[PDB]
Amino acid sequence: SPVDGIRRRLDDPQVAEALNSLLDHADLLAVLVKGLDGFVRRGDDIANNLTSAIGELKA
Amino acid sequence: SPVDGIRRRLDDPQVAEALNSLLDHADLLAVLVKGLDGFVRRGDDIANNLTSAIGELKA
Amino acid sequence: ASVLWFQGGACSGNTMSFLNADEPNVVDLIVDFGLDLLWHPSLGLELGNNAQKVFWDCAKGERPLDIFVFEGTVIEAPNGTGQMDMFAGRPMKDWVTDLAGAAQIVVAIGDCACFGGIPAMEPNPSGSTGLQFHKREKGGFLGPDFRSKMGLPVINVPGCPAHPDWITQILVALATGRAGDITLDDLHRPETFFKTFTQTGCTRVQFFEYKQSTLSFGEGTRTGCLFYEFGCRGPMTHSPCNRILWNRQSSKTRAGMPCLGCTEPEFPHFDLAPGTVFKTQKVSGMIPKEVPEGTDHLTYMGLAAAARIAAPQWSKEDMFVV
Amino acid sequence: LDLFVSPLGRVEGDLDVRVTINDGVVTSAWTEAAMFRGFEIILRGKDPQAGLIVCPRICGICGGSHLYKSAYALDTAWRTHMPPNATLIRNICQACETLQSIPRYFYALFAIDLTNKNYAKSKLYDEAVRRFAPYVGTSYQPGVVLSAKPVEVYAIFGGQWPXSSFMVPGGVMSAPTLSDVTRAIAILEHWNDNWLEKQWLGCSVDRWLENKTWNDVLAWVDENESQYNSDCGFFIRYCLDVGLDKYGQGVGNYLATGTYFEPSLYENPTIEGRNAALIGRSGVFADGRYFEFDQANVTEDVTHSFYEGNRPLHPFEGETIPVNPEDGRRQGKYSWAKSPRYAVPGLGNVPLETGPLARRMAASAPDAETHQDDDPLFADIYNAIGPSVMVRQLARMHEGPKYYKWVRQWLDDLELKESFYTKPVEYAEGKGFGSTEAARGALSDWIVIEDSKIKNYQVVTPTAWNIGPRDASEVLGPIEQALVGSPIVDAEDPVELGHVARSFDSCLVCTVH
Numbered sequence: 043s044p045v046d047g048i049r050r051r052l053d054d055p056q057v058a059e060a061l062n063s064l065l066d067h068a069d070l071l072a073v074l075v076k077g078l079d080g081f082v083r084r085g086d087d088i089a090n091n092l093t094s095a096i097g098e099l100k101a
Numbered sequence: 102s103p104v105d106g107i108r109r110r111l112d113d114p115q116v117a118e119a120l121n122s123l124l125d126h127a128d129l130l131a132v133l134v135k136g137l138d139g140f141v142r143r144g145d146d147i148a149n150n151l152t153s154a155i156g157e158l159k160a
Numbered sequence: 161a162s163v164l165w166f167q168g169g170a171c172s173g174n175t176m177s178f179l180n181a182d183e184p185n186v187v188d189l190i191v192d193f194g195l196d197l198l199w200h201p202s203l204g205l206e207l208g209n210n211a212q213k214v215f216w217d218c219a220k221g222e223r224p225l226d227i228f229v230f231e232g233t234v235i236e237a238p239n240g241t242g243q244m245d246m247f248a249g250r251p252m253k254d255w256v257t258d259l260a261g262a263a264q265i266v267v268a269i270g271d272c273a274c275f276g277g278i279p280a281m282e283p284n285p286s287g288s289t290g291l292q293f294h295k296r297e298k299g300g301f302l303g304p305d306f307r308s309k310m311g312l313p314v315i316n317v318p319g320c321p322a323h324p325d326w327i328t329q330i331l332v333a334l335a336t337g338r339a340g341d342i343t344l345d346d347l348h349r350p351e352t353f354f355k356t357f358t359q360t361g362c363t364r365v366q367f368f369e370y371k372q373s374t375l376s377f378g379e380g381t382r383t384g385c386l387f388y389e390f391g392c393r394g395p396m397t398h399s400p401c402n403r404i405l406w407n408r409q410s411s412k413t414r415a416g417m418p419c420l421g422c423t424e425p426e427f428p429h430f431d432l433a434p435g436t437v438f439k440t441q442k443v444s445g446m447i448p449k450e451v452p453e454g455t456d457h458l459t460y461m462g463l464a465a466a467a468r469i470a471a472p473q474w475s476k477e478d479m480f481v482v
Numbered sequence: 483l484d485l486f487v488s489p490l491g492r493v494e495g496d497l498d499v500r501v502t503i504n505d506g507v508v509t510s511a512w513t514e515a516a517m518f519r520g521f522e523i524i525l526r527g528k529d530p531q532a533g534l535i536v537c538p539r540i541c542g543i544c545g546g547s548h549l550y551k552s553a554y555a556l557d558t559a560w561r562t563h564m565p566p567n568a569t570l571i572r573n574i575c576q577a578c579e580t581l582q583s584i585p586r587y588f589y590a591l592f593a594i595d596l597t598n599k600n601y602a603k604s605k606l607y608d609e610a611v612r613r614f615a616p617y618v619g620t621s622y623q624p625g626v627v628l629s630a631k632p633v634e635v636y637a638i639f640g641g642q643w644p645x646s647s648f649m650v651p652g653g654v655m656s657a658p659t660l661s662d663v664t665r666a667i668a669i670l671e672h673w674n675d676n677w678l679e680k681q682w683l684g685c686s687v688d689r690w691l692e693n694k695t696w697n698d699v700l701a702w703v704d705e706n707e708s709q710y711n712s713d714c715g716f717f718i719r720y721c722l723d724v725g726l727d728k729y730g731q732g733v734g735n736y737l738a739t740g741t742y743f744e745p746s747l748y749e750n751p752t753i754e755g756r757n758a759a760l761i762g763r764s765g766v767f768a769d770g771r772y773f774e775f776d777q778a779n780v781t782e783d784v785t786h787s788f789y790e791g792n793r794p795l796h797p798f799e800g801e802t803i804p805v806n807p808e809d810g811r812r813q814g815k816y817s818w819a820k821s822p823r824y825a826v827p828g829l830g831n832v833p834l835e836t837g838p839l840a841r842r843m844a845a846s847a848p849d850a851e852t853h854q855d856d857d858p859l860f861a862d863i864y865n866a867i868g869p870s871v872m873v874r875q876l877a878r879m880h881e882g883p884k885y886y887k888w889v890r891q892w893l894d895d896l897e898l899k900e901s902f903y904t905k906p907v908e909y910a911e912g913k914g915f916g917s918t919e920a921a922r923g924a925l926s927d928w929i930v931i932e933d934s935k936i937k938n939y940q941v942v943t944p945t946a947w948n949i950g951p952r953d954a955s956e957v958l959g960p961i962e963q964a965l966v967g968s969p970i971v972d973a974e975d976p977v978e979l980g981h982v983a984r985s986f987d988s989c990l991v992c993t994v995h
């Protein structure tokens with residue numbers, strides 16, 4: 043089975059080592075995605091900030 | 102077993118917290134990869150758009 | 161040109177919309193354009209055995225059937241018997257089989273007939289399907305390879321209901337020798353109506369361009385585009401709703417109602433699942449899940465940010481003022 | 483003679499009528515609604531506002547009514563605030579749909595049967611044929627063509643007709659402009675002048691509304707040549723000549739849920755406050771007596787319907803579980819129509835005829851408030867000649883002038899600077915009752931929202947009231963009893979069955995949904 047093969051890859055010492063190092067820095071990945079979610083959910087505000095900034099340079 | 106070790110890391114409170122936060126913003130990751138897939142599948146169109154744009158600046 | 165108009169799992173909204181026809185109006189279409197309306201459940205004089213005589217003559221080829229219009233879904237339940245739609249002594253689906261096989265042209269009017277529409281929403285108790293489609297999937301009741309005697313597939317005049325012109329102008333074209341001018345898209349819809357989008361001619365496209373959202377219904381719709389907060393499917397929906405106005409007056413989007421994408425085979429989209437009605441599904445609260453047709457989320461969002469920055473003041477104010 | 487008429491068309495859907503005929507008279511009747519879509523089943527688990535999209539699709543001709551009552555079901559379920567302008571727009575659009583229905587149904591669905599060969603001996607038959615023949619009738623063509631105008635008004639406010647969902651909890655989606663209202667007024671005045679007054683009445687709406695008795699109506703017919711030769715005057719004379727006043731009596735008991743809220747009285751829709759706020763009054767007229775309508779008294783029986791069930795259910799606990807028509811017919815079930823019954827004290831759960839006649843009877847009830855329809859005309863007609871095909875039709879047609887005047891006034895009442903929508907709280911839970919008088923009568927939604935989803939959604943349409951089959955007590959539905967007693971001159975073309983069924987303006991897509 044192909045799913046069996048992914049489990050087989052997970053056994054690989056080198057694959058496992060890399061996956062473990064990814065889970066060691068999963069907090070950083072989580073925070074960067076949370077930061078991106080924040081940036082996206084405040085994208086309208088950042089757009090209004092760039093609008094007020096350009097609008098000042100217009101005046 | 103090395104795979105058992107990745108399951109062990111998954112138990113870790115801090116690893117689990119980060120993986121849960123990743124799965125919280127998974128929709129953002131999905132949409133960004135879908136956006137990239139879209140951009141790639143319309144890469145020829147964007148290339149034709151840049152060709153027509155440069156071709157205008159040429160004339 | 162004889163026309164037999166049957167209704168399966170229909171609400172008769174396509175007929176009522178059709179009766180709103182102007183230029184031609186329905187009476188002038190039926191009388192003055194040489195279209196002999198053999199029968200229509202809402203308009204035919206014949207009842208009972210006289211009506212059945214008309215139907216059987218059409219089905220068996222005793223009299224010519226030029227246009228078979230079908231409105232409503234092909235109801236197949238229960239258990240494929242179609243007895244949830246018994247018409248004139250038969251399951252309606254059997255009538256559909258016979259008459260679609262007899263007609264020179266078969267026209268499915270309205271999503272129900274074209275694609276299954278609202279009755280085909282899960283759990284689809286009536287086993288409803290379209291003539292040649294079930295939602296987007298080609299084949300429906302008649303099969304993907306069905307062709308009428310003029311060689312055409314089922315002409316899908318979608319909508320829920322179809323606008324009167326979407327059918328009447330096709331009928332006029334057929335009656336005036338312009339059948340060859342009729343081109344059909346991949347959903348068998350007349351491209352003369354369905355190359356445009358609902359957004360095409362929408363009074364709110366400038367707000368769309370500048371990513372100015374209508375925020376609320378009622379007076380809130382004096383400004384803004386409905387795409388961002390109300391799930392307007394205008395930019396993803398092929399229709400001339402804003403080109404050829406409804407009732408010669410308006411369109412949903414002009415009026416402040418989001419386009420529900422009813423000309424699209426998936427209608428009702430998302431099966432009206434909770435949270436999808438008059439709402440834009442968004443990723444991370446700001447990226448629409450569905451972007452306009454032919455755009456990708458990356459470019460669309462980049463252009464949207466640029467437009468929000470460039471947006472002129474009038475795009476942020478009421479425009480459909482008293 | 484057992485006569486099975488299939489199809490009986492021009493009832494907006496699939497209807498078969500079985501009748502027992504003895505000595506040329508129907509002695510028993512069964513109405514068989516033959517097409518089922520199951521929208522109540524579909525709505526379960528959908529978005530709480532899915533009704534605003536789905537319910538209009540119950541019916542093309544009266545979907546706007548469905549929208550109206552579904553919106554009010556949500557308004558009550560969510561305890562919304564309705565700005566007066568929103569109430570006005572809802573009233574206008576409901577009434578405009580009805581104003582479209584009145585001529586469209588009359589000419590396209592009903593009056594063409596007046597050309598039946600059974601009437602060839604009538605002295606008015608040639609004129610009836612000239613006027614009402616399908617597609618070529620001199621009254622048919624303008625009546626049908628102009629029937630599209632009132633729904634142009636509907637489209638002005640709702641974007642389109644049919645199939646807008648612009649009536650939402652908290653108001654309407656639209657924000658009418660000045661030109662919207664002026665154009666709506668112009669369209670309405672043009673339609674009134676060109677069809678209602680010129681063609682239907684041959685007089686002003688005011689002159690018609692001066693008719694307070696049946697004798698007033700007869701005097702109106704004879705008053706002058708314009709009224710005499712109007713479609714209304716001709717129709718009355720034709721009915722009296724050919725005997726349309728002599729059968730189709732029906733139950734003689736009526737249900738009106740009412741519609742058209744006075745904007746100041748229904749700003750916060752509730753089930754309990756609904757009746758007082760109505761302009762077109764609710765009212766049950768049973769055993770010659772007036773009763774207040776109460777939705778709690780509504781049950782639906784499926785004994786002879788193709789649904790599972792063993793007891794009448796109030797629609798809040800309603801269920802729509804189809805049974806296979808083969809099995810159901812083995813159990814004596816014969817219709818996809820449920821059998822709505824109303825608990826009238828001293829009478830039990832009785833069938834009630836719905837429709838314009840029911841509304842006119844309700845409007846004849848005492849103690850009308852100032853905002854409410856107070857019209858004794860059809861109390862007098864009911865007492866003088868009783869119900870019939872002619873009287874039922876006259877009630878329908880009588881609503882034309884009345885509703886036109888109401889719509890014109892409501893358009894004047896619009897305060898364009900004021901709100902059309904109060905954003906509601908979309909509560910995860912709620913029980914809503916929305917009701918209206920669609921063209922054909924009491925149309926009602928009982929909705930139960932649970933967990934931000936539709937937990938239950940039960941629609942009871944006016945034709946379900948009228949055409950619904952026998953209940954558990956074998957009591958015939960209003961249309962079934964109206965068919966009983968109908969003469970049958972020609973079993974090959976039993977046009978009188980059509981006259982009776984269509985005099986109710988039967989809508990079978992609504993009946994079953």
Ligand code: FCO
Nearest residue numbers: 544920922925945992
């Ligand atoms: N009018 C109408 Fe349709 C019916 N019956 C609904 O409600």
Ligand code: F3S
Nearest residue numbers: 171173270271272321
């Ligand atoms: S208008 Fe009615 S017939 Fe079907 S396409 Fe829409 S539910």
Ligand code: F3S
Nearest residue numbers: 362385386387392394
């Ligand atoms: S431009 Fe119009 S069609 Fe919808 S997406 Fe905006 S309201």
Ligand code: F3S
Nearest residue numbers: 399401419420421422
């Ligand atoms: S819902 Fe349909 S009628 Fe036009 S505005 Fe959208 S395609």
Ligand SMILES: [Mg+2]
Nearest residue numbers: 522940941942
């Ligand atoms: Mg029901």
Ligand code: 3NI
Nearest residue numbers: 541544989992
């Ligand atoms: Ni109806």
